[PDB]
Design a protein around this ligand. Structure first.
Ligand code: MET
Length: 239
């Protein structure tokens, strides 16, 4: 049986090629990997049938996308994830913020919400009490304490937005594939609500191949591999 994986390019793809694929092949499976540079296509390819499983998103994004596009897909298990971080842009230290400082952020809703929550924790802005952090939007800002100019861009353009803004909040997969290091972040999201999940069409939730893939991502072997290959990543809660 052939298992077709869809992942964003870089780390999640490497997990498959370097570790998961060889493990599944020892069980007779032929594995195919399709890598994407964007966040939009994977879930569509999954629902269409082109992919049997994808690994590139967190639950809030999945939930948002599924609803918006009415797709019968669901999460299965979590994977080691590169954490979200606020990195040095033109300014190199949090201490250097000032009135009007610019901060770049991804512009899709589920990820943008994360930037606002991070700015609230830094005390740069103040979010209204009782709002859903998962859906925080500009309308949820009670006071822009430091008059921060939040610059929004397509998620993939964040690493290089650093040349044009004081600070840049970059998604981990893009930070890593752009030559950035997690240790370079000035502040990292403390939350664990965004550790990424693999997704599949609901129809395959109980399949045998998915059971094999699932244990391949949770064996001691994988855990050892992950510990040395992806230092600094947030681990699946189940671990
Ligand atoms: C498509 S949702 C964003 C996924 C990305 N790997 C992150 O954890 O920030």
């Amino acid at each position: 049986k052939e298992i077709v994986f869809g992942t964003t390019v870089g780390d999640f793809g490497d997990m498959v090629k370097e570790q998961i694929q060889p493990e599944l092949e020892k069980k007779g499976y032929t594995v195919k990997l399709v890598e994407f540079t964007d966040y939009v296509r994977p879930n569509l390819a999954l629902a269409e049938g082109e992919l049997d499983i994808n690994v590139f998103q967190h639950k809030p994004y999945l939930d948002d996308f599924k609803k918006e596009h009415n797709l019968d897909i669901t999460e299965v298990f979590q994977v080691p994830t590169a954490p979200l971080g606020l990195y040095p842009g033109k300014l190199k230290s949090l201490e250097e913020v000032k009135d009007g400082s610019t901060v770049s952020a991804p512009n899709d809703p589920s990820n943008f919400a994360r930037v606002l929550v991070m700015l609230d924790e830094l005390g740069w802005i103040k979010l209204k009490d009782g709002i859903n952090p998962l859906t925080a939007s500009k309308a949820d800002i009670a006071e822009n304490l430091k008059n921060i100019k939040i610059v929004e861009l397509e998620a993939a353009q964040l690493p290089r937005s650093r040349a044009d803004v004081d600070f840049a909040v970059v998604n981990g997969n893009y930070a890593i594939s752009s030559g950035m290091k997690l240790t370079e972040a000035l502040f990292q999201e403390p939350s664990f609500a965004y550790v990424n999940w693999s997704a599949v069409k609901t129809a395959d939730k109980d399949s045998q191949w998915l059971k094999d893939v699932t244990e391949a991502y949770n064996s001691d072997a994988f855990k050892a591999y992950a510990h040395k290959r992806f230092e600094g990543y947030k681990s699946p809660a189940a671990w």
